[PDB]
Amino acid sequence: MVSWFKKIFKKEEKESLDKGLEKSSQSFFDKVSRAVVGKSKVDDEVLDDLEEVLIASDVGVETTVKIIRRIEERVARDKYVNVAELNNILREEISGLLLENPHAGTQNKTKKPYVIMVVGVNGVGKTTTIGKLAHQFKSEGLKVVLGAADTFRAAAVDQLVIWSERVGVPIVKQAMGSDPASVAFDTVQSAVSQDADVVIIDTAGRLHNKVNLMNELSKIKRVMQKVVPDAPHEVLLVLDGSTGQNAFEQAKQFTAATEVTALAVTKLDGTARGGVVIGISDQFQVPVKYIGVGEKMQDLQLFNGTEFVDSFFKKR
């Protein structure tokens, strides 16, 4: 039974999710409306055109096939279905589909500190997501320590320092080009000495050489295990949802190079390719855990596929 990471939405939080998905929702409704103009009943041609719309909405081939198969079956049972019901049918069938992945949601604690290694390619929103996470945890009364283990560019450390100041959490850092594993070691040591609750490690994720990537991330993990044997407790892969299915393929490439435990999909706000979240949640054997809906430290949400699909497809 799928247990979502976020079970309760405040009014403002559901509004933030609706707003984050607004452009994707409007784009999808535009495409379906145009596809069924002059049609009355859902037939094989309508479902063919709906498959084309779902693909054009970055839902992905394998997920779209499953969705159309479920709708085909439902249409065959009900015989006469009006095309105006498609948004409602999609909401119901896709919500049901996401609940079928046993790897979605939480699986339901280890000794502090809880160590998070944030991974992904440059530009997807890793460091921003780390700032948002630090805010999430500090708002709960937890003590957060950041580790600046993205040391390839000098700007990288500067950017995490900037976020450490926006939220008001300590940071462990060395120089540009310092050994990332050594920074991670120092970060976890400091967190243990300071009795901190959460450690978040920033990393480079230069995917062009998967051997070097694999070796760097494995060294970071192995060295942290000298201090905390079951660290990292979470390996969070950050993906740019504004790139649609490009993020799905990137996640496939990245998760084949290193062990990931959860996904974050950023930049859903103000872009129209958010349907990729549906395909990722359906196909991946690790959960979507966070979605990003803006530039500010509050613009992070724990994932709930049922609410995501509701916001994506409901009438506005």
Residue ranges of the binding site for GTP: 120-127, 202-206, 266-269
Nearer to a second copy, 64 or 311 (CB): 64
- Based on the shown chain and the rule CB under 6 A, indicate whether residue 128 belongs to the binding site for ligand GDP: yes
Give the x/- contact pattern for ligand GDP in 133-172, rule: CB under 6 A: --------------------------x-------------
Classify residue 315 by burial, with Cβ atoms within 10 Å: 0-12, 13-18, 19+.
Answer: exposed
Minimum CB separation of residue 247 from Mg ion in Å reads 17
Taking CB positions, which residue lies at the least distance from ligand GDP?
292
Is residue 38 within the footprint of a second copy (CB under 8 A)?
A: no
Quote the least distance from Cβ 2 to a second copy, whole Å: 28
Phi/psi for 207 (5° steps) reads -80, -10
What would the 3-class secondary structure string for 92-103 be?
A: HHHHHHHCCCCC
**Judged by CB, which is closer to ligand GDP: 87, or 159?**
159
With CB under 6 A as the contact rule, which of the stretches 73-81, 101-109, 266-274, 282-290 interacts with ligand GDP?
266-274
**48 near a second copy, judged by CB under 8 A:** yes
Between CA 41 and CA 58, with CA 45 as vertex, the angle to 5 degrees is: 105
Q: Looking at beta carbons only, is 127 or 190 nearer to Mg ion?
A: 127
CB contact set of 111 (below 8 Å; sequence gap of 6+): 228
Stretch of 118-126, 256-264, 266-274, 289-297 contacting Mg ion, by CB under 5 A: 118-126
Under the binding rule (CB under 8 A), the answer on residue 246 touching a second copy is: yes
> Which range binds a second copy by CB under 8 A, 203-211, 281-289, 294-302, 307-315?
203-211
Window 214-233: residues binding ligand GDP (CB under 6 A): 223
Binding residue for ligand GDP (CB under 6 A) from 22, 93, 186, 310? Answer: 186
Q: Which stretch binds ligand GDP (CB under 6 A): 71-79, 115-123, 141-149, 278-286?
A: 115-123
Backbone angles phi, psi at 73, to 5 degrees: -65, -45
Distance in Å, CB of 127 to Mg ion, minimum: 3
Binding site for Mg ion (CB under 5 A): 126-127
